[PDB]
């Protein structure tokens, strides 16, 4: 018979596939299901990052292979992005690594980091994909706990010395999936040197570091010791509404990339030349794009909370960075896999179990806001229509 | 200090992504004519580039998609399958999407082998199928290919013991780099031998347009062939679009859904305007391809017919792709030793066959990727060397 590895039914359950699965599924036809669950941008890509992509088509030297590594105009680009958005400053040619996608990123950096026996320190709750590199690597996980009291930071005293001796990789998440925390230049100093003490390699997951509301968002690599340490993982996808179009990069250690390089030569040849100069083109737009898509996820956020609130009672902590809300569970339902199946159901309306980040997940839901005003007040208006005590203590 | 995993320091440098390298560095120094890594001269076909240009505007594909691709593009993969080798394929269990052959040879793999486990490789072999089983942390048994065999393996010779063990074999055909083309006998007896061995049978199938004479079989044509196995198609080749990183696998059932579990935390599918793309190639008219196959069949007659007159360098003409296998002359060592010569004096990259297996060392590889023009220029670059091309073989 054929018999696949046993890792690869070792891996979670993609939760998000088995999602998408159940959805189209339940198809009055495609019944008017409001999702909140995956973090799908609702919203097109910029018509600008489009026409790049257009124009680039047709230009004959992206139609056979291109550099292995990218394109040089991608990699100075990506410098410059992060020079404007971070006052960081890149070296494009050995600092810049690309990638088919953030989810690619992480996989790839952790198959270049990672040894069998190794510990990886990974959050909890945190992205379930981190638990993939690190399965597929042959590694052992250690959790470190998120709680609500540090702001979701994690304490790095907390963790056992004995632990400490085996670790060599660390993910962090800022702003965070799923809890909406936001960190600081200051807490990035703090994990750096945490870090560079124990030899510990860093990769700081910065998927949403276009979303933080309360302050212009800090990149991992402002701090001490950062590009010594680790790298930061950027991605398309929640920037530019170009989560379709599979595109990301990570900026960091010449040797870290280095690595990098040489595992992707083997699996990959760059990638389209049309992407990397839609990418191009996304880097080098203007600042008010994003700025407006901040803005129309921090009003989205402002309604959604204010109005579970005003007709549940159903308390959010408004998340200061990300699309996402973090919401405890009332009592009145059982656990966070439980209590989705039942909106589904009753309702028609899709949010993710806490319970898929990890057990400090248990008893909260994550709720998406990628949706317009009608969908999100929709939402509510079913919930209400549940009649069931939704009120939070 | 910065450590990469054990994994990336058993890996070999990728030879393509080194010559990338040099030559570049040359370019800069101030011409080379480059016939080693196998890359289309000629553009995509307009139909294929206006089906991303128009399907680059729909919103839909903007945001993430299927994870398993479109059924669509699944759809037109088996259409496709019918409609150029006859072969039944379920669009909706026997098909997976891969950005480009090369990824789909990692994952698969990936999901076909443990660490430890032992594949069966041909030898010589594209340079990847070792790549993978290193990436896999798995041991490799040669198959050799002998061109008295027609460099077809023979399977009774491989030592009935090591097959208890093995659980993935590669073959290739059209062969990259002899141009040895297989029959549907030897699919018959590979699969059957694979069956009794309860061996995994991957097909690369990256050529499976260009055989000369006849439209080559494919493996899925074989009694119990989609029990055993899986072919790998890219659109590199058929379609010059190389840049475009586009492929895909058909199979048995579990083959790919071991692949699909896999991807599913690793590649979210592709940009669907990409998907579009490739459903206009496998849907458009098959004699855009059919007059393909005959350029490469002039240059190989042009270009064989040249250097038998002008260098004396006599070559089997191949029975398919566009590469001519030649021996290198008598009194170089190596192929590598012959390659970089070749670079250094007359301005021209052909392929070390070493890089493929003990198997091509006295052999380089050369790519039909020019113009008639251009291969004459190549000739007439190395006639001025006066080089020996006497055989010892
Ligand atoms: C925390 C986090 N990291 C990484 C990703 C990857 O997204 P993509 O693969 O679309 O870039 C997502 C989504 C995410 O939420
Ligand atoms: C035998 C063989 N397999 C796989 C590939 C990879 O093709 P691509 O990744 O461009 O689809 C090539 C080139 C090849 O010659």
Not at 15 to 37: D, P, R
Not at 86 to 91: A, L, Q, S
Request: charged share 20%; glycine share 8%.
């Amino acid at each position: 018979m054929e018999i696949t590895p046993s890792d690869v039914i070792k891996t979670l359950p993609r939760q998000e596939f088995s999602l998408v699965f159940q959805k189209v599924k339940e198809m009055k036809t495609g019944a008017h299901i409001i999702n909140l669950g995956q973090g799908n941008p609702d919203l097109p890509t910029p018509p600008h990052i489009v026409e790049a992509l257009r124009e680039a088509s047709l230009n004959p030297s992206f139609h056979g292979y291109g550099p292995f590594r990218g394109y040089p105009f991608l990699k100075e680009a990506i410098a410059a992005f992060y020079k404007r958005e971070y006052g960081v400053t890149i070296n494009p040619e050995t600092e810049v690594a690309l990638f088919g996608g953030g989810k690619a990123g992480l996989y790839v950096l952790t198959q270049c980091l990672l040894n069998p026996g190794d510990i990886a320190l990974v959050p909890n709750p945190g992205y379930p994909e981190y638990l993939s590199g690190i399965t597929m690597a042959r590694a052992e996980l250690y959790e470190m706990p998120l709680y609500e009291e540090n702001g979701y930071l994690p304490d790095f005293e907390k963790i056992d010395p004995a632990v400490l001796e085996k670790a060599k990789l660390m993910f962090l998440n800022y702003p965070n999936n799923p809890t909406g925390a936001v960190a600081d230049a200051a807490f990035y100093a703090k994990a750096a040197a945490f870090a560079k003490e124990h030899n510990i390699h860093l990769i700081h997951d910065f998927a949403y570091g276009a979303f933080e509301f309360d302050q212009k968002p800090a990149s991992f690599l402002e701090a001490e010791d950062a590009k010594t340490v680790g790298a930061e993982l950027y991605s398309f996808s929640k920037t530019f509404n170009m989560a379709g179009w599979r595109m990301a990069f990570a900026v960091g250690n010449e040797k870290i990339i280095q690595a990098v390089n040489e595992f992707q030569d083997h699996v990959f040849v760059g990638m389209f030349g049309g992407l990397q100069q839609a990418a191009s083109a996304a880097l080098s737009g203007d600042p008010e794009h994003t700025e407006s898509l901040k803005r129309i996820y921090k009003e989205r956020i402002d309604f959604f909370t204010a109005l579970c609130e005003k007709e549940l009672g159903w308390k959010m902590e408004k998340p200061k960075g990300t699309f996402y809300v973090w919401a405890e569970i009332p009592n009145t339902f059982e656990t966070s896999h439980q209590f989705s199946d039942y909106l589904l159901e009753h309702a028609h309306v899709v949010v993710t179990p806490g319970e898929i980040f990890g057990s400090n997940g248990k008893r909260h839901v994550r709720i998406s806001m990628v949706s317009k005003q009608e969908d999100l007040r929709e939402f509510v208006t079913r919930i209400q229509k549940l009649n069931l005590p939704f009120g939070s203590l």
